[PDB]
Amino acid sequence: DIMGDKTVRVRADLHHIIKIETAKNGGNVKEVMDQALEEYIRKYLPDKL
Amino acid sequence: IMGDKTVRVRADLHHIIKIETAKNGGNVKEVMDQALEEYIRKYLPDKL
Numbered sequence: 620d621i622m623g624d625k626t627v628r629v630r631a632d633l634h635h636i637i638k639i640e641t642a643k644n645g646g647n648v649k650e651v652m653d654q655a656l657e658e659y660i661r662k663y664l665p666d667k668l
Numbered sequence: 669i670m671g672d673k674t675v676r677v678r679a680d681l682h683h684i685i686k687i688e689t690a691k692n693g694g695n696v697k698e699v700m701d702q703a704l705e706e707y708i709r710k711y712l713p714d715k716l
Contacts, residue, residue: 624676628697633704634673636715649676652704656681659703664688 624649672697 629652637651660667677700685699708715 623679625679625682626674627677627682627700628672629675629700629704631671631673632716633701633708634675636708636712637704640712651707652675652700653678653681655703655707656677656685656700658707658710659699660681660684662706664684667684 675700 634648637646637648640646641648641651682696685696689696689699705716
């Protein structure tokens, strides 16, 4: 069940957009990025699962 | 001209992208950016 994280870089303008949204009420940049990756993988690399 | 910011992502998802990108030859950052931009245009239209 354990899993660590990795530091990566992303365009500042994209980061700013998520930062602003998660700052409103509920949300976390890390969670958004993970979800964004999961959707990318499901879309372009479906041969995963 | 556009700078970058750091973010923490799940290690398993990163590994999957790293393996896949290594095949073709590109870099992980381009994938992170595409993944995030697509998420934004989908759930946060008009922000870009």
